[PDB]
């Protein structure tokens, strides 16, 4: 929801999300929904974004309407920040448990230490039920099961109220007598030495001694109970296992890419060389969370968000099968209302008019090839 505001070129060349899937579109309270997919870290990572040496797999959502039960990069849990390598592809999986009823736009996002939020595609997920039914049980290594919704809440309230009461008692003890104007006049007109006299000093000594003694006793009591404690577990996690993708058999060279100002279409001329041993056909162009599809070649069945999906938004001048070894140059047009709705056309405002994206090539059998393209994006006005 915070996207459509970030720079178009920055959204185009940071992280490309694809093969996204959602286990459910509509869930009950306490029910789990799983979000899977892959993200590729673009090689032309903008210099204004710090390299993803410290990155966190986050979820874009309006507060804890879901709780993040688990999150994985590769196949291992990532509750801490992780190190990503530029040019690598990683698979991810986030498990969410529904907590608050409503219709929520859930994004998978990557927060980068010195670059800010990189928001992936967002999907509307409906939660039904009551928040009062939500439970978040955890079992500790000390053998007790607690609900994270209300665990320690009473203790927190008690201690805060107790210390607030002590402070209020101190202030009220001094506030029984007149406060401001008579005391000011006594201090000014001559030596005061009369508004602070025993047993005021005795009360202050009692307050100080009781405060120190109560702090010490409470610490000792909180040590006898909960004798086993550990510090907060933190630290960036290295060694994220990237995907071992095969080298693509399709090479694409971008010769000029243009978009009309104003307009809802982006045009580029590609020289595609087909290696391997099967006829290929261009089926998809993904630029920034927006999938332009050639409906005659590929159809989306993963329930991709409709406002981000252009079913027939990709038109290839010659999308006939490309025989192996053959090289041809085609004009590719990616047109959809999403290009203006998600403010991809506002790259004219950007100080770096370069685009990046993913091309998906499909053969007759159905297996697909992912090739990455990047080029300057030249506006056209006349």
Partner 1 sequence: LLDKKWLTFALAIYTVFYLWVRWYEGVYGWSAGLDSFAPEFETYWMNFLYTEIVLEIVTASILWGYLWKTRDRNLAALTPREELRRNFTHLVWLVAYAWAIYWGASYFTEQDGTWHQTIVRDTDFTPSHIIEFYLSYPIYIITGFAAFIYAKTRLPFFAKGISLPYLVLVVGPFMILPNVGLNEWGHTFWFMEELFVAPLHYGFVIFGWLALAVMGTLTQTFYSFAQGGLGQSLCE
Ligand X SMILES: CCCCCC(=O)OC[C@H](COP(=O)(O)OCC[N+](C)(C)C)OC(=O)CCCCC
Binding-site annotation, residues for Cu cation? 1, 16, 40, 105, 107
Annotated binding site: 1, 16, 40, 105, 107
The residue count for binding ligand X (CB under 6 A) is 2
Mark 314-342 as b/e (b = at least 16 C-beta within 10 Å): bbbeebeebeeeeeeebebbbbbebbeeb
Give the interface segment with partner 1, choosing from 110-118, 196-204, 217-225, 234-242 (CB under 8 A).
110-118
- Token pair in block for residue 187: 């201090």
The site partner of 228 among a second copy, ligand D10, ligand X, none (C-beta below 5 to 8 Å per kind) is a second copy
Out of 138, 168, 216, 261, the residue judged to bind ligand D10 by CB under 6 A: 216
63 part of the interface to partner 1, by CB under 8 A? yes
**Using rule CB under 6 A, residue 185 touches ligand D10:** no
Single out the residue of 87, 114, 167, 325 in contact with partner 1 (rule: CB under 8 A).
Answer: 114
Q: Which two tokens stand for residue 101?
A: 């009823």
Cβ-Cβ contacts under 8 Å for 20 (sequence gap 6 or more): 35, 36, 37, 108, 120, 121, 302, 304
Decide which of a second copy, partner 1, ligand D10, none touches 186; Cβ closer than 5 to 8 Å per partner kind. partner 1
Nearest CA to 16 out of 266, 250, 286, 245 is that of 286
Q: Is 114 in the site for ligand X (CB under 6 A)?
A: yes
Instruction: Tell me whether residue 138 or residue 184 sits nearer to partner 1 (CB atom).
Output: 184
Q: Could you tell me whether strands 66-73 and 76-77 are parallel, antiparallel, or unpaired per DSSP bridges? A: antiparallel
For residues 199 and 174, what is the distance between their CA atoms, to the nearest angstrom? 12
Q: What DSSP assignment string belongs to 20-58?
A: EEES-SEEETT-EEEEEEEEEE-SS--TTSPPTTSEEEE
Q: Whole-number minimum distance, CB 212 to ligand D10, in Å?
A: 6
Taking the least distance from each CB to Cu ion, the nearer of 77 and 245 is: 245
233 binds a second copy (CB under 8 A): yes
Token readout for 263 is 């307009």
CB of 305 to Cu ion, least distance (A): 9
Residues that bind partner 1 in the complex, under the rule CB under 8 A: 1-5, 49, 60, 62-63, 105, 109, 112, 114-117, 119, 180-182, 184-186, 189, 343
Where on the chain is the footprint of ligand D10 (CB under 6 A)?
212, 216
């Amino acid at each position: 929801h915070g996207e459509k505001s970030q720079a178009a070129f920055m959204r185009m060349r940071t992280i490309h999300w694809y093969d996204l899937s959602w286990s459910k579109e509509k869930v009950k309270i306490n029910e789990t929904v799983e979000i899977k997919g892959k993200f590729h870290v673009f090689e032309g990572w903008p210099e204004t974004v710090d390299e993803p040496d410290v990155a966190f797999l986050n979820v874009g959502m309006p507060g804890p309407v879901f709780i993040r039960k688990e999150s994985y990069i590769g196949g291992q849990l990532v509750p801490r920040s992780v190190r990503l390598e530029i040019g690598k592809t990683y698979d991810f999986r986030v498990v969410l448990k529904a907590r608050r009823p409503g219709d929520w736009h859930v994004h998978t996002m990557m927060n980068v230490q010195g670059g800010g939020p990189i928001i992936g595609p967002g999907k509307w997920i409906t939660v039904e039920g009551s928040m009062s039914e939500f439970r978040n049980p955890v079992t500790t290594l000390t053998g007790q099961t607690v609900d994270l919704e209300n665990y320690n809440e009473g203790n927190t309230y008690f201690w805060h109220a107790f210390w607030f009461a002590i402070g209020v008692a101190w202030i009220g003890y001094w506030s029984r007598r007149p406060i401001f104007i008579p005391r000011l006049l006594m201090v000014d007109a001559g030596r005061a030495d009369e508004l602070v006299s025993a047993t005021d000093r005795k009360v202050a000594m009692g307050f100080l001694a009781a405060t120190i003694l109560i702090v010490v006793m409470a610490m000792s009591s909180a040590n006898s109970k909960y004798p086993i404690t550990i510090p907060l577990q933190a630290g960036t996690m290295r060694g994220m296992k990237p995907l071992e993708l095969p080298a693509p058999t399709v090479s694409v060279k971008v010769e000029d890419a243009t978009y009309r100002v104003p307009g809802r279409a982006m045009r580029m001329k590609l020289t595609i060389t087909n290696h391997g041993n099967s006829p290929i056909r261009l089926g998809e162009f993904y630029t920034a969370s927006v999938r332009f599809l050639d409906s005659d070649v590929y159809k989306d069945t993963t329930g991709y968000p409709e406002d981000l999906l252009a079913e027939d938004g990709l038109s290839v001048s010659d999308n006939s099968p490309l025989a192996p070894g053959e090289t041809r140059t085609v004009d590719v047009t990616a047109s959809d209302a999403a290009w203006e709705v998600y403010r991809l056309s506002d790259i004219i405002y950007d100080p770096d008019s370069r685009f990046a994206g993913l091309l998906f090539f499909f053969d007759a059998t159905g297996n697909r090839q992912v090739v990455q393209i990047d080029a300057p994006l030249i506006p056209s006005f006349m």
